[PDB]
Amino acid sequence: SKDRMVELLQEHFELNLYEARAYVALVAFGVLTPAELASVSEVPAPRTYDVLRSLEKKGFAMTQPGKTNKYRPVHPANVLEKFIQDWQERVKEELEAKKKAKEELLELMAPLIETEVPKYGVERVWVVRGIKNSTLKTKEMLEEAQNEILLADDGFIAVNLEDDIIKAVDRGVKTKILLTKNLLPRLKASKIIDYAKEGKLELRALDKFDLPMLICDEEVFFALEDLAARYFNYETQVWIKDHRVVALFKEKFNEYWEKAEKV
Amino acid sequence: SKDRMVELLQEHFELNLYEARAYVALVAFGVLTPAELASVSEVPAPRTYDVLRSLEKKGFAMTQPGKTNKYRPVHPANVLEKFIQDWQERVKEELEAKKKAKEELLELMAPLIEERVWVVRGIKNSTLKTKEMLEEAQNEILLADDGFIAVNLEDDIIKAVDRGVKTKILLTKNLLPRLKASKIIDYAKEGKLELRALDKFDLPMLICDEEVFFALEDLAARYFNYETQVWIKDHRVVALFKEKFNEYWEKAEKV
């Protein structure tokens, strides 16, 4: 049926329902006026004028501009192919746009695209208070270290982490431990000194220092001194991830590293 | 990224506004949570979820192993090209569909198919009528092409000449390179078709043989591809244009 003809035009030749029905009628009857198209098709009378005129622009029909516009269809063997030929031409240029767009994006993204692979955030600053939260974040730093692990503990750490440290040390992580001499007695049964005496890590001690810290690679962990709170194990501690800041702390640690007696 | 990266993705990669932003965010940080997204981007929190699964269903993001739940970006160099390929192939699938749809129509309209002036809109449709004039030619063919009137109809011209039709061809010098591999020149130097060329002429036309075809000139119309072209079937009119053709003909090189 003609339904098939109409259906084919809409899908592959960019003609709408009315425009489709129109062209089919044109080929069928040869020459038609807007008024005639309404009687020999299903196209609404009021639309027959802009529909045929629309076809006039797309190149499907020819016209006689007058009081009574006459329209005749172009040979379907002609229009149907030029459409494809043009359609192939429009797709080619549309392709060119996609490639140039790709190159630009790959150019703009080059500086932005980085091997950053979190490790959740995105967050370079974290506030920890609880004893539970203090330990969990402490383990993450050690169990994720890759280059160096620097520790300056004066008893602000809630729990001993010998195993968490050794777990990293055995992973090929260079480690430096600095402790207050009022902590050494607590390390007699702990077998970290073994790694120290065996030279698997460096362990020194100092009488006192007012800037405890835990440096793990680009991350650093310290507390906002409030001795009243530390006793209640609710002291506020801050985690910061930045090479500029850590680079600064590393200098202080090196400062503390000296003047320290080897255990 | 700014407007530009989000812009290109929307315009040339079928991504909506939110999706365009989200993808950018992923590329920047590598891994993002729906909440982390709303915070870092101008994508509403309530939309961050649906938008993210829309980015994986489109192939820009993929859920990282281990929920719940983080998303990673598909590296641009990969996802961008795969979109092009999958696009070209959908195009190739269409062009063939068109070529197949064309034949089905032509076979359906066969039964249906079986004066004195007609108008054609657009210089890109000129050949839709000039061809019928070349197939109906019997005695004489005079052509002064500007580059649009009879493009890619070289076969119908030679085909007409073989039918013993007197053929005179006048061209602009800028069209010479196009005829290099053309069989037309082979018919010109063989002396079965006259072919002269000149620099510029005001009125391009095609007369074959008692019919005339010419295009009007209105710069405003040419922007919209709505230039007016006229087909007139009249010996008195055609005779007039022929005087003009013979006029242009007098100042040309054999070439």
Next chain:
Amino acid sequence: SKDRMVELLQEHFELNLYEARAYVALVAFGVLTPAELASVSEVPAPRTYDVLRSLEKKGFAMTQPGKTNKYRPVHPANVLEKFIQDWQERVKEELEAKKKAKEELLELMAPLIETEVPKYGVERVWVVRGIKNSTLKTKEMLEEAQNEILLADDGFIAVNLEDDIIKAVDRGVKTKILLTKNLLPRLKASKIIDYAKEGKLELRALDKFDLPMLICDEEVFFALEDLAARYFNYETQVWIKDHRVVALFKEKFNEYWEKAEKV
């Protein structure tokens, strides 16, 4: 009331309802957590987390990144103006963008804009049949002539237009009339020759010619010879508006003009 404060923020500071209520709550209580904000405001519990984060980015609140995010408002005397200062920077560039866009449009549109203002549509081609339609279009040409009017009539014109011609001639339009001498007898008593004899226009005559035409400026009007139709006055005539085409017709008329007797 708080309504006013909220109402004012939404309208002039680009904050939505929830974000507004949030900031108001922040200033009221000083420091709040997402959960707390739900109890002292109208912000939905589930939204309080992304809302505070939203204020955090716009610069309305400060935060303590942790398991329990603490948020504090920035002094409204600060943010409210800093917003304006930024708002003016964004409006300024948007202005420059609109202006830079303006110059570009005026360059691209310069060649397209022309003082051409047609009387009856942007149609340069008309097909006319019948005496009524033939005459109306003929008068339009005369009532629109400005430079020159060239006429070669052999009776294909449906009606005498002496007055329509004179109306134009008196308007300062140079006119040339060419007729078949088998029409002159139809001009006895006619007061057109007066303008001819008085030299207000040029009037000549010729034995015969097979290309009648009516040239009015850039327009030309002729018929596709069908003597059978001309008798029934239904011959098909064409109106064309183009200087290139008319320039050709003007030459043909000039050809007949010389070989024509001035009588």
Next chain:
Amino acid sequence: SKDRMVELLQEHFELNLYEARAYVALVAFGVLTPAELASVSEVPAPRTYDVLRSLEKKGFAMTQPGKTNKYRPVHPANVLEKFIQDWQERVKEELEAKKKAKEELLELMAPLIETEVERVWVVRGIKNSTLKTKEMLEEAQNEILLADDGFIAVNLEDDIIKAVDRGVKTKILLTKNLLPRLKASKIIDYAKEGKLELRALDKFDLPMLICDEEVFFALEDLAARYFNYETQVWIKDHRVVALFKEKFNEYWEKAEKV
């Protein structure tokens, strides 16, 4: 480039898709009938009518005197300028509305403000740095150390000078690219007067603001700065501040006097 023109009209002139196309068509031919438009343009016939009166209601087109239902275009050089001006005036009309709304809020929030404990806060965006650095300058009493990159303490010269007048020792270190900004600035008047040391250096890794045991610094992540989400930290701690102060004093000795 018709595509370009329609693009620009839509982007910078609040014109709809059809309206942008319609106007262009008008400019090309000068006068168009709704039917004549649909034929020559990509505007649907059923829309050409409403669209045209929408172009006049925006001031791009006007009904011909005929009228004969014909529309002519308002010359771009005119209609374009009229849009900007009427926009600027609508903008200036808004700026005052904002400035007026601002004061009304401050008087409404006056009763609320009675709170301005915690010693650490985070601020998102280098463009929001001053929202906190200001409070640090108002609370200054003894010492102020500033290493500005051009964002840490921008437009706070008034709050800075006010602090200096309160007898606070002030050292300001800047990048050479910031020197031109201080031209005719009263800072120099306080510099040449010798009540505040002002040195300059080429480049330093860690910009900061130290004022009375408080420190303000911004972290560095290029990805975040694109989104204006750079993380900035405020820390109130003598041990920490003392650390930053050591770094500042380091930069200070290598800086140029200016």
Next chain:
DNA sequence: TATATCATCGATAGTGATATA
């Protein structure tokens, strides 16, 4: 009967409420 307008659908994009553990 030609000149004039409407109604439908799906896609966005903004913004204010609700749902599963």
Next chain:
DNA sequence: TATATCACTATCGATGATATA
């Protein structure tokens, strides 16, 4: 209590139907 999704609105653009002299 924190994660999770939804929902109502307007504007837009393409498409199929009516309206008024």
